[model samples]
Target chain A: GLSDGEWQQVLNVWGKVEADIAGHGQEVLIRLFTGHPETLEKFDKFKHLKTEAEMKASEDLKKHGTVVLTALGGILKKKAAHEAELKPLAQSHATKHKIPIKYLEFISDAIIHVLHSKHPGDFGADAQGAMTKALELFRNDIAAKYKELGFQG
Target chain B: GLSDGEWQQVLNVWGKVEADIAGHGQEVLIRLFTGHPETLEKFDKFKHLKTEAEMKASEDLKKHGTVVLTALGGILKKKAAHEAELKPLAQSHATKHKIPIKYLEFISDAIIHVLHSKHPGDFGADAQGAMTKALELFRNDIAAKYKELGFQG
Candidate 1:
C-alpha cells in the first residue's frame, strides 16, 4: 500500500546491497564475525576464518551470504506469510542445529552497523530508520517462529 | 541493517502502488475522505465532492493525492532527514490551517484501509505490518513537526 513514491524510496534504500550483493553481503558477515566472534563461532565455515581478508575470500562465506539474502527475499515479500515462511528456516537452524537467537541478533546488529556505516549518502537517517524498523519486524518474526517451535533461545 | 533478502522483501511489499500510482493514490484519499467526512471538511477543494465518482472526477483530489504521495516519498527515503524534510509541509499545512494531528491520523488510517482492501495478495500480514510501522513513524514525524510549529490541532 505504499504509494508509488514510497515504494521507490524503499527500493532506493534496499537496492544498495542488491547492487553489490557479494561485496556488501560478505562485508556484512565480516562485520558480524569481527564484532561478535561468538556469532562467528556458530558458523561452521566462517568460525575459522579469523582475518577479514580470509573471511572475504571464503567461497563458503559468499555462498552463505547469498543464502541469507535469498531467504530474506521470501520472508519480506508482500504476500508471503512471513512467520509461516520462516518456520522451516527456524526449525532447521534454531531447532535442529540448535543455534540460539542471540547469535542471530548479533548478526542483525552487524547488518545495521554495516548499513549505517558504509553508505552515508544512501543510508541517511530516514533510510536507516526504515531499514531498522523492517529488520526489527523481521526479528520479531524470528522470535515468534522460535517460540512456536518451543525453542527458548 | 537488513540483509539483502530482507531489503528485497521490503521493496516488493512496498512496490504495490508504484505499479499504479494515480488510481491507487486517489483511492487512498477517497477512503480517507469517505470514512471521515469531517476531515474532508478541512479540505476546501474536496469538501463538496461528496460522491466517490465526483471526487474521483475532480482533478483537485487527484492532484492532492499526488501531493500526499510526493510528501511520503521523501519522508520515508533512506538517507533523507525524514523529520527535517517535513518541517515546511507540517508548518504550512498543520500550522497555518490549524489541522489537528487527529485528521492526519485519519488520513493514515484511510491509507492502510485502501491498501489492505484493494491488494489482498500484495498487502499480506507482513506487508501490512511493515506499512503500518512506517506510517506510524510518519505520523510521529507529523506530531513532532506540529509540536515544533506550536500547533496542537
Candidate 2:
C-alpha cells in the first residue's frame, strides 16, 4: 500500500522497534529470538553492538543464540492474559489507600520513567525508593482528608 | 515513637514498599541483598504470603536457601526496568504525530502496570506483550516524528 521510500520508512521503523524491544532487557532478546528463528542470524550481523566481555558471557551467548531467542519471543508474545490477575491487586491497593486515581497514574508514570531510564541493575533500588515515596505521599494525602472528615481510622 | 499498632502499620506499609521494590524483579533483589544483607533477612521473615510452590521450589533450596527469592526478585526487577526503557522513544513518537500525551501516557501506564504486576512464571506473557506493543508504538512515533521534523541524515 506504500511506495519504496515509505517501505524504507517501515523497515527503518521495524529496525528501531527491534532495537528498542531489545533494550527492554535480555528477556526480550530471548523472546525475540525465540519467536523469530531468523532474528539471531540477523542479530549476529549486529553482534558488533556487544562488547568483547559480553560476547564471552554464557548467558549472553545463550540469549543471543537463534533458537533460544525465537522461543523466548514466542513465549513473551503468547502470555498476554496474565495481566488480569494483577489488575485486582493494583486496583484494591489504590482503593484501600484511598489513592486518587490521578495520583496513582502519576506514580505509575514516574515508575516507568525510572525503569526505562536506568539499567536493569539499578531499577530496583530506584523504583523501590520511588514507590515508597509515592505510597507515603498518597497515605499522607488520604490521612489529611480523613482528618478533615473528623475520622481516625 | 508510635504504639504497637502504629508500628504494625509502619511495617505493613514498608512491607508493601519492599514488595513493590522486589516486584520490580530479581536483579533488584540481588542488589538489595548484596547491598543490605541485614535488611533483606529481616524483610524475608515478614513476607509470610508467598505461594507454597515458591516455598517448595528447588531454587529455594539451593545454596543460600531463600536467597534465591531475594536474588530472583532482583533479577525480575531488572527485567521490569528493561521493559520500562521503551517510553521516551514512544512518547517522542506520539509528540511527532501530534497525538495527545495522554494517549502515550495511557499506553505506557498499561505497559508498566502489566510488567510490574506479574511474576516471570505466573502469567508473564502479558507483560511481554505489553512491552512489545509499547516498543512498536514508540518506534512508529519516533520514525514518523523524525521524518516529519527532518532529523535524519
Candidate 3:
C-alpha cells in the first residue's frame, strides 16, 4: 500500500494527464509493442499489424487502448476500494492470455515514460516513486493470483 | 439532451448502481442474453455458451461485461462530451460484429430492467423517462454511425 502522501502524489500526477487518457494509453501500448515486438503475438488481432504506422491507424487499437485507460482511471479514482476489483482481470491475463509478469511490469515503464515526456516538470523523484509503488501494487496483486493458480510465470 | 433535472435524476439513479458496477454490469449482459438469446450469436466467444449458468461462469463474459459497463459509466459522467465517443464503438459493432440495431435497443431494455428490479422505488416515472432518454441518445449516436457506414442493419 502506498503511504497517504504517496497516494496523494499519485492522484495529483494522474490528474495532470487524465484529460488525454486514451492518447496517453495508446502511447503506453505502442511503447510496449515497440520495445518488445513479440508481445504483439499475444493479441490475435494485432499480430498482423506490420508497422507502427499501421498500429497508429488501427481503429481496434485505439478503441482497446481507450477501454484499458478508462478502466485504469476508474481504478485510480477509488484506488483503495478498487484494488480487489482487479483480481479477476489479473486472473484472466494470467490464465487466459498467459501474460508474463515482465510484460505487466513493462506497462509501468510505459506509463512512467508518458509522464516524463508529457509532464516532465511534475514528475519529480517523489512522484516517480509514488507512481512506481502504485504500479507495483497493481502488478503484485495480479501476480498473486497467478501464484495461487500455480503459474510458474 | 436530458433536462437539468432529468440529468440529475439520471445521476442519482446511476449512483445507486455505480457501487457494484461490475456485478450490475454482468446482470445487464446476462439479462440481455437471457431475454434475447439470439444476441449471443454476435459474440464468437459467447456463441457456444449453452445456458445462463454457463454464461455466468464465463470469465470472458464477466470481463467483457465489465468493460462495456465501465465505459458506460464514463460516458454517463460526461454525457454531452462523450456522446460522440460511442460512434466508433457503434461502427465496430455494426461492421465487425454485424450486430443488428435491435440488439442494441435490447441493451437499453436490459439496463432498464436491472434498474427497476434493483431499485424499484427510486425509478419513478421521471427517473425512468430520464434514463430512457439518456439511453436513447446513446443508442441513436451509435445508430447514426452505423448509418454513416452504410450499414443496412
TM-score head-to-head 2 vs 3, winner: 3
What is the Cα-based lDDT of residue B69 in candidate 1?
A: 49
Ranking by TM-score: 3, 1, 2
Interface RMSD, model 1, angstroms: 24.1
lDDT of 3 at B25: 57
C-alpha lDDT of residue B89 in model 2: 36
After TM-score superposition, the amount by which residue B134's alpha carbon in candidate 3 deviates from its true location, in angstroms, is 35
What digit string (tens of lDDT, one per residue) describes model 2 on residues A1-153? Answer: 122333333333333334544333444344444444343444444554344344434454544443422432333332221222223333344445343444434434443443544434444544445544434533443444445444452
TM-score of 1: 0.28
Give candidate 1's chain B TM-score.
Answer: 0.45
Show what share of the native A-B interface contacts model 1 retains: 0.02
Give residue A102's error in model 1 in angstroms. Answer: 40
Docking quality level of the chain pair in candidate 2: incorrect
Q: DockQ: which candidate is best?
A: 2
Query: Which consecutive 10 residues in model 2 chain B have the weakest lDDT in total?
Result: B1-10
What TM-score goes with each of the models? 0.28, 0.21, 0.28
Candidate 1 docking: what grade? incorrect
Q: What C-alpha lDDT do the candidate models reach, one value each? A: 0.55, 0.38, 0.58
How far in Å is the alpha carbon of A80 misplaced in model 1? 19
DockQ-based ranking: 2, 1, 3
